[PDB]
Design a protein around this ligand. Structure first.
Ligand SMILES: O=C(Nc1nc2ccccc2[nH]1)c1cccc(CN2C(=O)N(Cc3cccc(C(=O)Nc4nc5ccccc5[nH]4)c3)[C@H](Cc3ccccc3)[C@H](O)[C@@H](O)[C@H]2Cc2ccccc2)c1
Lengths: 99, 99
């Protein structure tokens, strides 16, 4: 759908059998979810933002269903304040930014 | 314009006589620019992001051109690693996110 930016663009994602709300974030390269349980294996990694780095777990081939749209990607799971859907997934749902 | 998100969505902005590139960021509530000289009066503000919080200085009523769009707003300048146009100016240029 089209979304304005007066409110922050949140959508509902289904991941790991769990339903969450997440930010659609053009500025984020990767998707970063707060701590939750996935099954399977992961790897450590650090990402950066404002403030600095966080260490995160990298899970590959995770199916996310964003709004209704299935997508399979890597998600990072860690101490983010907010769940973030980032460009690696935005591309798969076809998101565009218009101005 | 319309931008897809396979690459970082960077635009040229002109602020304070200076040419910068900036990231259009739907996840960011506020616009946050790296350190630069700006005329005037500022208040320190603390803001948060992934990885922590930064203290920034707030100039209000700055004119910024982002593509050929003048917008006037509050701009926070400080130790971000990228300049980020956030929803406060995104709204003034009429940007929309779509899927
Ligand atoms: O993949 C990521 N990395 C990464 N991949 C890697 C691969 C390999 C190696 C290393 C890697 N590293 C990554 C994923 C998600 C977010 C980020 C970092 N990231 C933010 O950190 N941010 C804070 C941000 C940016 C701009 C403005 C604000 C803001 O206004 N905050 C605010 N708080 C307030 C409190 C009081 C009053 C006013 C306030 N205003 C906040 C918000 C997301 C966010 C929103 C809310 C809460 C937490 C996070 C932006 O949306 C994001 O795009 C982005 C912006 C950004 C992008 C790059 C560098 C720095 C920053 C990075």
């Amino acid at each position: 759908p089209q979304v304005t930016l007066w409110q922050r663009p949140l959508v509902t994602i289904k991941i790991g059998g769990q339903l969450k709300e997440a930010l659609l974030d053009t500025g984020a390269d990767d998707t970063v979810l707060e701590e939750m349980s996935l099954p399977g294996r992961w790897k450590p990694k650090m990402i950066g933002g404002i403030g600095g780095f966080i260490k995160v777990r990298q899970y590959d081939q995770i199916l996310i269903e964003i709004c209704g749209h299935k997508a399979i990607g890597t998600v990072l799971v860690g101490p983010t304040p907010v769940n973030i859907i980032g460009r690696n997934l935005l591309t798969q749902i076809g998101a565009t930014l218009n101005f």
